[PDB]
Ligand binder design. Structure first.
Ligand code: HEM
Length: 289
């Protein structure tokens, strides 16, 4: 199954920076969302979940087709709460009707990471919307109540190795769990991208507790929380080594996260040899906007 990137007609870096800017401006404007966390974290999560359906074996799912817009996928129980991110992006898509859905969703994620002071994430245009019947079935996104072996195996389907998995999970520094979405509650509620997930894993005093939805989670007196799959990264000795590396090297984490997030967002896509180079968008702050 082959998906070839096709640039929206006539569009260049400048067009997509405009889209970036609109998303970034709306992120600053609608600052009250989720108890003043803002839409940053849910847009990152949306970009991952639209990409996380990918299957390297037959190239079903993946960000290319923009299939989150179809009910089967936006109603996936794994995607509960993502509708907020989609609703955010709706006026963006109305203003820039030329961008594809997959490009918009992935770009939402990139814009969110950068505006929250994360690393630059090179981004490539050219995803093309595909019909309803290409929508992957529910069930391809990962469970939270599992261990290190589950996590490692899960991510093999997205062609990610130990380093990539540990790097990607660092996004859980952002936002929080919502009992009504996932059966988990709590969390940092941070909207600044840093390597704190690793620091928290290593430095907090964690207690295995049951939440109000009758699910187990790791809680700290400090008020942080970790999913069983998060916590598995310090139970497994290979994952633990990498957790300690990122906890001790902000720049290294930023560099690896950037590589892994782009890869994630680009899985399944074939880029023509003469496609444009990846775009690196300036932040509003860099633009003085
Ligand atoms: C084994 C892997 C993963 C599991 C089981 C998982 C699970 C979860 C769960 C259950 C939530 C809370 C949803 C809700 O209640 O609102 C959460 C939140 C989130 N996830 Fe993950 N996740 C995983 C990996 C990732 C990765 C790879 C990314 C992105 C690079 C990511 C980004 C986030 C972020 C940004 C949120 C915060 C959402 C917001 O605050 O609304 N997740 N995830």
């Amino acid at each position: 199954l082959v998906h070839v990137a096709s640039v929206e007609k006539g569009r260049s870096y400048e067009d997509f920076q405009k889209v970036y800017n609109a998303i970034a401006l709306k992120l600053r404007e609608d600052d009250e969302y989720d108890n003043y966390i803002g839409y940053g974290p849910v847009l990152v999560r949306l970009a991952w979940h639209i990409s996380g359906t990918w299957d390297k074996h037959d190239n079903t799912g993946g960000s290319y087709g923009g299939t989150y817009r179809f009910k089967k996928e936006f109603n996936d129980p794994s995607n509960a709460g993502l509708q907020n991110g989609f609703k955010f992006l709706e006026p963006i898509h109305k203003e820039f009707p030329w961008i594809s859905s997959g490009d918009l969703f992935s770009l939402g994620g990139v814009t969110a990471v950068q505006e929250m002071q994360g690393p630059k994430i090179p981004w490539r245009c050219g995803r093309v919307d595909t019909p309803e019947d290409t929508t992957p079935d529910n069930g391809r996104l990962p469970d939270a109540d599992k261990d290190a072996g589950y996590v490692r195996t899960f991510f093999q389907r997205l062609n990610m190795n130990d380093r990539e998995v540990v790097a990607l999970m660092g996004a859980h520094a952002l936002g929080k769990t919502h009992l009504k979405n996932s059966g988990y509650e709590g969390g940092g509620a941070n909207n600044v991208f840093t390597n704190e997930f690793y620091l928290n894993l290593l430095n907090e005093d964690w207690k295995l507790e049951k939440n109000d939805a009758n699910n187990e989670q790791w809680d700290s007196k400090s008020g942080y929380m970790m999913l069983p799959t998060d916590y598995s990264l310090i139970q497994d000795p290979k994952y633990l080594s990498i957790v300690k590396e990122y906890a001790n090297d902000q720049d290294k984490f930023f560099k690896d996260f950037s590589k892994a997030f782009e890869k994630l967002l680009e899985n399944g896509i074939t880029f023509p040899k003469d496609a444009p180079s990846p775009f690196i968008f300036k932040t509003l702050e860099e633009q003085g906007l």
